[PDB]
């Protein structure tokens, strides 16, 4: 049972620059002191990435501003989030996000992650509902509150869970019937922007889902310190978490491989003529 959190449909999203982000290891082979050219669905350098702010707005403005819209999935998406206290917890992928078609549910409680692809009738605004208490000063159990019905399940997988301080990055890609996740976790300290630096994502898992993926919606966990059974959707706060979504595109890259096998630099071969001449000169 889910009670609609917000009446406002949308707010005008503002975009930031993804400076040299979202580079993932193309293959599982080791290379040292090697400049390597590889073609894949990479995220274009200096692109436009939508900036989402799920934070509590000041009391003068309307009481609710947190946003979790159903966003398109276009040949893979790039996802980042700068947060503390694990506000973001899971994502939902699927075509219609309703009962007739299958969809992928990937939700991660701090101790564990559940990855189920099953027909799901979804709530408009799905959220994991945590509660907190004042006398004990401890944080308590949660309520899932993400789907009304689950039927015809075909794959279950459970594994170890995968200012601002934490910067988590994920790249999702569906190719040839497999769903592949690339991840990287990096402590940072710039509060409101993507860092100016290079980080390489490592292959976490590839799954044999075999489902059509057209749209995805992020899952945020919300906290309220009082619970009554007959009244909900009143008193939820989003804390302070921001997530960023970019879109992948078929592009050619040239990668600098370090002595110890790390990826330290890469070049977009279509940014400008200078980048193209660097890509061809290698």
């Amino acid at each position: 049972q889910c009670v609609n959190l917000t009446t406002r449909t949308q707010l005008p999203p503002a975009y930031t620059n993804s400076f040299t982000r979202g580079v993932y290891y193309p293959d599982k082979v080791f290379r040292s002191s090697v400049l390597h050219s590889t073609q894949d669905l990479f995220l274009p350098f200096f692109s436009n990435v939508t900036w989402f702010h799920a934070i509590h707005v000041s009391g003068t403005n309307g009481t609710k501003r947190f946003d979790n819209p159903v966003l398109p999935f276009n040949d893979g998406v790039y996802f980042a989030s700068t947060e503390k206290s694990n506000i973001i917890r899971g994502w939902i992928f699927g075509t219609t996000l309703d009962s007739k078609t299958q969809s992928l549910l990937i939700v991660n409680n701090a101790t564990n992650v559940v990855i189920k692809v099953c027909e799901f009738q979804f709530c408009n605004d799905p959220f994991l509902g945590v509660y907190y208490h004042k006398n004990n000063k401890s944080w308590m159990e949660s309520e899932f509150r993400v789907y009304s019905s689950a039927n015809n399940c075909t794959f279950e997988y459970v594994s170890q869970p995968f200012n601002f301080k934490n910067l988590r990055e994920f790249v999702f890609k569906n190719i040839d019937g497999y769903f592949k996740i690339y991840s990287k976790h990096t402590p940072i300290n710039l509060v409101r922007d993507l860092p100016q630096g290079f980080s390489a994502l490592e292959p976490l898992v590839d799954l044999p889902i075999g489902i059509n993926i057209t749209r995805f919606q992020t899952l945020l966990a919300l906290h309220r310190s009082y619970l009554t059974p007959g009244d909900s959707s009143s008193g939820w706060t989003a804390g302070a978490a921001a997530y960023y979504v970019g879109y992948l595109q078929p592009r050619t890259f040239l990668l600098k491989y370090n002595e110890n096998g790390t990826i330290t630099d890469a070049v977009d071969c279509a940014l400008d003529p200078l980048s193209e001449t660097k890509c061809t000169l290698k």
Partner: antibody, heavy 117, light 112 residues
């Protein structure tokens, strides 16, 4: 033991606001929630709502939603209730209560009784 | 909103007699997620501020041991005394904690 200190009996004119004070010892109001209560022998006792000192906001009941306001300040261990203007319905006994999260009301003061000429 | 009814209105029994009071609700009190019944019971004397008796049917709290024993259902709720005691002149109420407002029952009185 927890005990509460409450406004004494009041005799007032209609057509004007009224203020109440509910006091606590042994804890900070931030630690809990605060309910308010008005009681009538005939027509029974009524439930007003809860105010959160930590939130800075308050969720009221619907019967009392009109003609009611709640305020709190942590500097003193005191919570306050006020009404827009005194009607015959408001000419009643009043109580304040403390509500634990995920729980019931646990503390009730001596009370306050409003009689009107 | 939830509405509460109480019975008996008033009953007179000798000290040591067994007495039972029952209050009935028009909606369910069970909450599936916790499987917990959000109901409490109160006892009050004239001119004494109402004080909570232990909720969730676990009525046992500090005081004289097992003063009053209670039983509840999804829609029905009863309180029992195995032997009426002379000191415990009491008036009782039934309240619910499922949705606003927390209902107050019609009241129950016990006379000796």
């Amino acid at each position: 033991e927890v005990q509460l200190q409450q406004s004494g009996a009041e005799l007032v004119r209609p057509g004007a606001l009224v203020k109440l004070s509910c006091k606590a010892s042994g804890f900070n109001i931030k630690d809990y929630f605060v309910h308010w209560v008005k009681q009538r022998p005939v027509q029974g006792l009524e439930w007003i709502g809860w105010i959160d000192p930590e939130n800075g906001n308050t969720i009221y009941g619907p019967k009392f939603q009109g003609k009611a306001s709640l305020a709190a300040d942590t500097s003193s261990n005191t919570g306050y209730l006020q009404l827009s203007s005194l009607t015959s319905e408001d000419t009643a006994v009043y109580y304040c209560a403390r509500w634990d999260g995920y729980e019931t009301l646990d503390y009730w003061g001596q009370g306050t009784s409003v009689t009107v000429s | 909103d939830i509405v509460m009814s109480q019975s008996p209105s008033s009953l007179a029994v000798s000290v040591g007699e067994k007495v039972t009071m029952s209050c009935q609700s028009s909606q369910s009190l069970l909450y599936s997620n916790n499987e917990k019944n959000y109901l409490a019971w109160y006892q009050q004397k004239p001119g004494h501020s109402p004080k909570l008796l232990l909720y969730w049917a676990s009525t046992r709290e500090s005081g004289v041991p097992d003063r009053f024993t209670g039983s509840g259902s999804g829609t029905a709720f009863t309180l029992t005394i195995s032997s009426v005691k002379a000191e415990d002149l009491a008036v009782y109420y039934c309240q619910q904690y499922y949705n606003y407002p927390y209902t107050f029952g019609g009241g129950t009185k016990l006379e000796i």
